[PDB]
Amino acid sequence: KGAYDTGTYANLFQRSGYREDEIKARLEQTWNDLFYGDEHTRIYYPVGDDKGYMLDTGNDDVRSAGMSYGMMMAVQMDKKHEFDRLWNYAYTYMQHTEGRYKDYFAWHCKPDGTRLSPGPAPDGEEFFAMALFFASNRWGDGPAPYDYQAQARKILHACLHQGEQGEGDPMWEPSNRLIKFIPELPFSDPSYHLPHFYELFAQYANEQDRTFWKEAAEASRAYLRTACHPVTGLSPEYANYDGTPAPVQLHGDFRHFYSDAYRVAANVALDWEWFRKDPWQVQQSNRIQAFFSDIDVSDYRRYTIEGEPFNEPALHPVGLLATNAMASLAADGPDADSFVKRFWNTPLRQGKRRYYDNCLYFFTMLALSGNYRVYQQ
């Protein structure tokens, strides 16, 4: 049975031999460096009395995915103040109050809150909704905008019914129950697929949508089986609804294993840890760890999903090690302990490109200490 049914979370740091005190301190020190660390390490920045943002340091903006990432880290760590500062910023500056994107969030803005593009990212919305459901269960609803449950339900309403409310489109294709790359375009991004979160949406969302979310969870597990390479285990950044890599886009070639697709291995690992529903998840985890066992973090590259390496180095190599180590939740092969130990001796990234590395790093630190949990009731 999964951790959702048993209430028991795998502490793989402790299984690998590390002491419970070493682990709780490492995790408290990983939070302290990210939220209150120095200029070269921190990614969280407080604003006024009641707002804060997660800075994408590489791109010098604030992204709906980062905000929603920060809000999940905060509710997992029982840090309501940082959560509420992040949620106020997202609510205040990013959420649309009218138009084709009503109740969606602008995917990026300037740190002062100036929208740079109204284009939303389903990535962000599904994470805002899961963190807000968790905040409600851990802390309980206050006045708007901190009526966490109603905020979560209103986002997931828009995600399924935007088309009916006017000239907009939903973030799930109703025919196949699959999340889209953006509302307007007929393909997907495998790293956006979170069957584990849809399971909990099927419990906590508006009653009329709960049957849909259950089918979406079932549908996303099937999808990831068609999207992930059967030999190497690598997925493309953008894929078609049939799981083949999506055509080259005007903004770039997303058919290869890069930044976006790293989150897949971690997404698969946590669904297995929570729900134990698809045994394929174990072999998928075994495959990606098997693929990367012989490769140094500093030698990580772009790869075709066929394992063909490019000359180009990975932009976020600590992010990729983090997601490979997270796959140890599902993997039971000969490389699982190596990745847990490797991860433990990897510090936080510093510098200009540290944002994505350090987010993925932290979710792995949570999950490998047994601290990425479902908060119920």
Curated annotation (Swiss-Prot):
The active site is at residues 65, 260. Optimum temperature is 40 degrees Celsius for the hydrolysis of xylotriose. Transmembrane segments: none annotated. Optimum pH is 7 for the hydrolysis of xylotriose. Its EC number is 3.2.1.156. The keyword Transmembrane helix does not apply. Pfam families: Glyco_hydro_8. It comes from the Bacteria. InterPro entries: 6-hairpin_glycosidase_sf, 6hp_glycosidase-like_sf, Glyco_hydro_8. Belongs to the glycosyl hydrolase 8 (cellulase D) family. Involved in depolymerization of xylan, a major component of the lignocellulosic substrates. Acts as an exo-oligoxylanase that efficiently hydrolyzes xylooligosaccharides, releasing xylose from their reducing ends. Hydrolyzes xylooligomers of 3 to 6 xylose units to xylose and xylobiose. Besides linear xylooligosaccharides, also hydrolyzes branched xylooligomers, such as xylooligomers decorated with 4-O-methyl-D-glucuronic acid moieties. Its proposed role is the degradation of xylooligomers produced by the activity of extracellular xylanases once they have been transported inside cells. This is Reducing-end xylose-releasing exo-oligoxylanase Rex8A. It comes from Paenibacillus barcinonensis. The lineage of its organism: Bacteria, Bacillati, Bacillota, Bacilli, Bacillales. The gene is rex8A.
